[PDB]
Amino acid sequence: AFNQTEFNKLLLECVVKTQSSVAKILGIESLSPHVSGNSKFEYANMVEDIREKVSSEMERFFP
Amino acid sequence: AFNQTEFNKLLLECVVKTQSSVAKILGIESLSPHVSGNSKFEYANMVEDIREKVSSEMERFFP
């Protein structure tokens, strides 16, 4: 009833597709008229924040 | 105890649901007036980019 390889395929396809799609959404949103002048929401600034968060979570599980 | 089958069910439901939801968000955002007339944020173009990124990540684990 269960195929682990197929499960991993779908799982990986979903999370990679979602991250890539979310990056683009973030891009469009950072250009939104109602946040301009708020630098907290400038694309580069947000990407830096995000990478920092990722690093600290990854460092926890992978040297 | 920790039921692995139930964990997998919830896991898969979340990631599939999120990818489908994010596809729709991407669609709506692509139509946003502030990014209209920008070939960078045209739906078809972004979908192509995304699929390319998925391919290269999938090919890494699944020959």
Binding site: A23, K24, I28, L31, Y43, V47, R51 | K40, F41, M46
Partner: peptide, 7 residues
């Protein structure tokens, strides 16, 4: 990195 780039 620019809006719409993968990161």
């Amino acid at each position: 990195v620019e809006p719409g780039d993968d990161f």
